[PDB]
């Protein structure tokens, strides 16, 4: 169809945004950037539909142009800027920091973090290659390319990053028994420690996972994100800690506290 599509119709918009059917036709089209379209959360959704800071979209431009909001340390004036998983959103006014991190329902959660935790992030290396002039580089899930990494760093290993500089301050290997955040599938948002991995040469390695209720489940390797060691993450987890209560359990909990 002759070239890049510049619009996004509502109902064609990713559901984890939680936009409403009526009250419009289109939805914001995520700009090109660090994260894929269907997995991102544009700033206009975050500053309006999440934080209720603005009413109009026109006011979301108003806020942005004054350089209030900043992503991963830089200013980010784009209205539709594609902020993804692991990213750090910071309001210097209001003194608030945010890390974008998934629900148990597979949605981006409003998550408040500390001032100091907001100075670093994690990313999964999607590839590691040998660049021009013999300089090896790694590339992470948010599109960072980092020259001269550790030789022991291989694909799927997560990486801790400075954000005030492009440097890697540590890394975590992909091994049996490492803390894991599920990004993808219908298990998206659960956190499971990695029981064991299936090989399957020729495509789609399976990865077996268990949270602690001692429940099990499986996703494709591509959808696994290593966040740490058993019981100890490298970032602050949201409430509920990806346990995924059953519909009954939720019903019980929600009706367990009825007390006024």
């Amino acid at each position: 169809a002759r070239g890049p599509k510049k619009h996004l119709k509502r109902l064609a918009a990713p559901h984890h945004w939680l936009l409403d059917k009526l009250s419009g036709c289109y939805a914001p089209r995520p700009s090109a950037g660090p994260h894929k379209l269907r997995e991102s959360l544009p700033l206009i959704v975050f500053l309006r539909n999440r934080l209720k800071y603005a009413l109009n979209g026109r006011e979301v431009k108003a806020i942005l142009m004054q350089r209030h909001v900043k992503v991963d340390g830089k200013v980010r004036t784009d209205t539709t800027y594609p902020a993804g998983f692991m990213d750090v959103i910071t309001l210097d006014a209001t003194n608030e920091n945010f890390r974008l991190v998934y629900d148990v329902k597979g949605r981006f959660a409003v998550h408040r973090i500390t001032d100091e935790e907001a100075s670093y992030k994690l990313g999964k290396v999607k590839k590691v290659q040998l660049g021009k002039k013999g300089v090896p580089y790694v590339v992470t899930h948010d599109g960072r390319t980092i020259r001269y990494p550790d030789p022991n760093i291989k694909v799927n290993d997560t990486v801790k990053i400075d954000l005030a500089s492009g440097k890697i301050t540590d890394f975590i290997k992909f091994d049996a028994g490492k803390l894991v955040y599920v990004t993808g599938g219908r298990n998206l948002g659960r956190i499971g420690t990695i029981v064991h991995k299936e090989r399957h040469d020729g495509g789609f390695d399976l990865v077996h996972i268990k949270d602690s209720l001692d429940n099990t489940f499986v996703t494709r390797l591509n959808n696994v994100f290593v966040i740490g060691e058993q019981g100890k993450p490298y970032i602050s987890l949201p409430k509920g800690k990806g346990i995924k209560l059953s519909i009954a359990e939720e019903r019980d909990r929600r009706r367990a506290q009825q007390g006024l």
């Binding site: 119709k9 509502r10 109902l11 059917k21 009526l22 419009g24 036709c25």
Partner: peptide, 8 residues
């Protein structure tokens, strides 16, 4: 180009 208004 609006979501259909559903009815029954």
């Amino acid at each position: 180009p609006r979501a259909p208004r559903t009815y029954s």
